[model samples]
Target: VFDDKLLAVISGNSIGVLATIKHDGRPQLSNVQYHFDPRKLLIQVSIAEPRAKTRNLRRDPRASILVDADDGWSYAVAEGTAQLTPPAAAPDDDTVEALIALYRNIAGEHSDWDDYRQAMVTDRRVLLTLPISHVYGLPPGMR
Candidate 1:
């Protein structure tokens, strides 16, 4: 369920399947922790070293993200272009703080806000902003 009535369902999940093109023309898929921002059509995720997805994005910007409900009654499929971002390209300090807050809000109280802030700010972290070019999804039986 990825429409207006399914906003609640969308907000309830934090992980999704992300697909990008591999070097050999195959789909490289991974389940990644994602923060979906409907307003910006943006999907943000943290990246560690030797980033395969980042390397793929450098070659091909096209990508997709999928989130589904456990009961199979709801799903969201988002296709967009992803760009590689350096640490400097990341949001400013205030924005970064806001992002940490949002992470805490979405991930629940057990989320370590301090740790997130330290890790995100202390090290060189890249931020990616995806602007959706196409989105096709079904809400429950709408398929």
Candidate 2:
């Protein structure tokens, strides 16, 4: 899953499907934006507010996430657990500068992302780390 091509494609995407267990044992899935650091096999998701996934994790941390194949013929999935992490510090002189540089490489300078990011973190956001314990990739022919 940490292969260069899969990493590249997952990093390029902003949204994917995340599944977590509900209080009653049923599964709850959602569409959300996620970040992946292939080097660490680290996956992170920012919870916007009092949402289902957030509620689900509060009760049960185990989760599953799926990323659509760039070719649209397959997908990759992972079973993991979500552990709460401290929220990211507000963007600032040092942080913003670093963020800008990093984001510029991913998004581009033309994108007015600072303002967008400011609005996003202004309100409380929950960050969860998902270190996958099991993962599988299924192409069209397999599943």
Candidate 3:
């Protein structure tokens, strides 16, 4: 579960280090863009094909995400199970649009959502959804 502090960190930071277990039981880490959906209580991240993280997730859905504040000291680590969303049929899917918006918001004024839309739809993109099982962090005072 996420508190206001954790929510702030998760929302403010676009990058998160996702950890997954490889087939040989090695750990693979990937820096990924993420959207924390409070309503759904899930963290969603998109990844293209031929990625080791994707392969690792396929074999082991159990994963963890570490998102830190810009200051570096404040952070949260979430442990959970993950599932990949199938590729979008078109760029118009509601889910795709929501994700695009999330990325666009993080990208600010310089972002060209239209340009990114095609690539997202065409690429072998997988939306990894992680529903948090446990989350802990070093909130401001504690940090």
Candidate 4:
């Protein structure tokens, strides 16, 4: 469950290090941008291309994500299994709007959501959804 402090850290920090399992049984780390949905307790990461991390996720859904506050005082490490959803060949307006909403949450109100939709869809983006299994972090008092 995401508490107020952990939620603050995750929402405030848009980027995290995603750790995945490689084919050769190795660990691969990728610096990824993500959107955290508090209601579902889910993390959605957009992958614009067929990269090693994406391949690994397909092979193994297990993943770990670490997000740290900018001040470095708080951080959250979440371990979970991922679900990969391939992008549509040409996403419909509704799909595009969903993507836009995610980006808008990460970006600000002034961000151009259309540009994000165009770039990601044109690049054949896919999404990796992670469900939190365990989350550990340092709180202000503990830090």
lDDT of 3: 0.76
lDDT agreement with native, every candidate: 0.65, 0.66, 0.76, 0.76
Estimate the Cα RMSD of every predicted model relative to the unseen true structure: 4.1, 4.4, 3.2, 3.0
**Candidate 3 local lDDT, 35-60, one digit each (tens):** 78878767888776567888888878
Candidate 3, residue 96: how far the Cα is off, in Å:
5.3
Clashing pairs in model 2? none
| Residue 64 lDDT in candidate 1 | 86
lDDT of 2 at 46: 64
- Deviation in angstroms for 129 in model 1? 1.9
lDDT of 1 by residue, 36-140 (tens): 777765677755424787678778878888778656666777688885455422435654555564565457553565666567655555555566666666656
Off by over 4 Å in 3: 1-4, 88-117
Q: Is candidate 1 or candidate 3 better by lDDT?
A: 3
Model 3, residue 76: distance off in Å is 0.4
| Tens-digit lDDT track of model 2 for 72-110 | 657777678788643335755343444444455445674
Candidate 4, 1-143: lDDT as tens digits: 34567666776777899999999998999899998887888888877547888888888889999899767867888789997666635546555555666666767563665566677678777767798777878744557
Error of 2 at 135 (Å): 0.5
Q: How accurate is candidate 1 locally (lDDT)?
A: 0.65
Clashes of 3: 0
**Per-candidate TM-score against the hidden true structure:** 0.68, 0.67, 0.76, 0.79
